[PDB]
Amino acid sequence: SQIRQNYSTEVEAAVNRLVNLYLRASYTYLSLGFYFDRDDVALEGVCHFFRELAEEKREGAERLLKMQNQRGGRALFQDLQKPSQDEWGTTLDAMKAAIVLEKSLNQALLDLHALGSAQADPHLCDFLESHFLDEEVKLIKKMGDHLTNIQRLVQAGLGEYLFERLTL
């Protein structure tokens, strides 16, 4: 590549893996969103919360792909595994599954930053710090806050309704 400079094959490969993780997270949230739109679940604020996360994770993957090209790396796509569940249980179950998911993405970001640091690739390090690391910390904080309020509320049916109406 005529433009490629200081960009290791190890980072290029890890960026392609992180793209797959973000697209898989987007797919998981798409499934979560539509589950809460079911007529027998019917929590529209929960549906909107997850649908908006599907969109954020998709945008995250496209920013990584744009960066891959900016550095002269080559995008390589793999299958997207279907989400781990077909039905997601209560808002509480779903928010616990969402935090598990986000912590895995954050750990993948931290591993990639560690690789870029070892490879002495400061553009990559800065890119992650600028667009991903702080967004994940803020999102995990918000989910943890939601989890705490959901738990304080669970008359489990009444608590689920009020959280969706008054917080989401």
Annotated binding site: 52, 55-56, 59, 62
Question: Of 26 and 91, which CB lies nearer to ligand DIE in the complex structure?
Answer: 26
Question: Of 123 and 131, which CB lies nearer to ligand DIE in the complex structure?
Answer: 131
Q: Which of 44, 6, 40 is nearest to 125 (CA)?
A: 6
Taking CB under 6 A as the criterion, the residue among 48, 58, 63, 123 binding ligand DIE is: 58
Joined together, the tokens standing for residue 113 give: 């930053």
Using CB under 8 A as the binding rule, whether residue 84 contacts a copy of itself is answered as no
Breaks, C-N > 2.5 A, in the chain lie after 154
**Touching ligand DIE, residues 59-78 (CB under 6 A):** none
Taking CB under 6 A as the criterion, the residue among 11, 18, 30, 65 binding ligand DIE is: 30
Whether residue 154 contacts residue 41, with contact meaning beta carbons closer than 8 Å, is answered with no
Q: Point out the annotated binding site for Fe cation.
A: 52, 55-56, 59, 62
Distances (CA, A) of 88 to 47, 99, 116, 168: 12, 13, 36, 18
